[PDB]
Amino acid sequence: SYDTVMDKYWLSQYVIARETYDWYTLQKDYETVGMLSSPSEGQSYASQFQGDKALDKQYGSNVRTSVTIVSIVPNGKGIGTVRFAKTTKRTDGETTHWIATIGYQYVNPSLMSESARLTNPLGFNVTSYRVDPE
Ligand SMILES: CCCCNc1ccc2cccc(O)c2n1
């Protein structure tokens, strides 16, 4: 009940943050992914925005990828499944569907600063992340 709803919330929040490309919210989404990810999942995500072919450098404000959550199943054992679709346009675009398998946990929220808890009250933490076509 409380746990399932709360897991769905954070799993939802993470996917939206991770799979959205929007130049004007990129920094916030980026830092959100970071705060909610393990160091390894963080650097994996961050690699998209590194180098001469970084997404931001390659898309600027001329592209937007919106995310729509279709369903979420926390398998109760640290693995969550998120079915979602992505729409990309050039500033009705192509729409594709996806399945995100997410390893995640909650770390003791007391181990954060207060500021950190405003972003991550439960210590939600994504240990692994993979997204496959459907
Ligand atoms: C083609 C979708 C594959 C899913 N992988 C990712 C993973 C992180 C992302 C961050 C910003 C924009 C995207 O299209 C992203 N796509």
Side-chain angles (χ1 to χ4, degrees), residues 2-134:
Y2 181 94
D3 285 353
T4 298
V5 169
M6 201 60 67
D7 286 355
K8 293 187 177 178
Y9 178 70
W10 289 106
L11 285 173
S12 176
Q13 289 300 121
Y14 188 80
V15 172
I16 295 177
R18 182 149 187 168
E19 299 298 340
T20 283
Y21 182 84
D22 185 326
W23 172 271
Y24 297 98
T25 68
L26 181 46
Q27 188 189 11
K28 276 193 184 68
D29 293 335
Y30 185 89
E31 297 186 345
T32 297
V33 177
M35 295 283 305
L36 301 186
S37 297
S38 72
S40 64
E41 276 306 337
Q43 180 57 201
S44 181
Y45 163 82
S47 70
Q48 291 172 114
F49 304 100
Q50 297 177 330
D52 291 350
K53 292 201 303 179
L55 271 199
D56 55 338
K57 297 188 191 68
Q58 179 180 337
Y59 287 176
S61 44
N62 304 338
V63 183
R64 178 174 176 186
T65 296
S66 179
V67 169
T68 299
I69 303 310
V70 170
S71 64
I72 295 173
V73 177
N75 299 80
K77 268 180 268 61
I79 298 290
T81 303
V82 183
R83 286 185 165 81
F84 69 98
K86 302 180 71 167
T87 303
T88 306
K89 305 191 188 69
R90 287 180 177 178
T91 303
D92 303 319
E94 53 275 9
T95 294
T96 43
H97 301 256
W98 305 89
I99 310 172
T101 312
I102 313 180
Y104 70 94
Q105 55 179 351
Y106 295 94
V107 312
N108 196 328
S110 65
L111 293 165
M112 310 185 188
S113 57
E114 209 201 31
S115 315
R117 282 184 294 266
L118 291 186
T119 296
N120 195 10
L122 298 187
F124 184 75
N125 185 243
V126 167
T127 53
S128 80
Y129 188 82
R130 61 171 301 171
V131 22
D132 309 285
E134 192 151 14

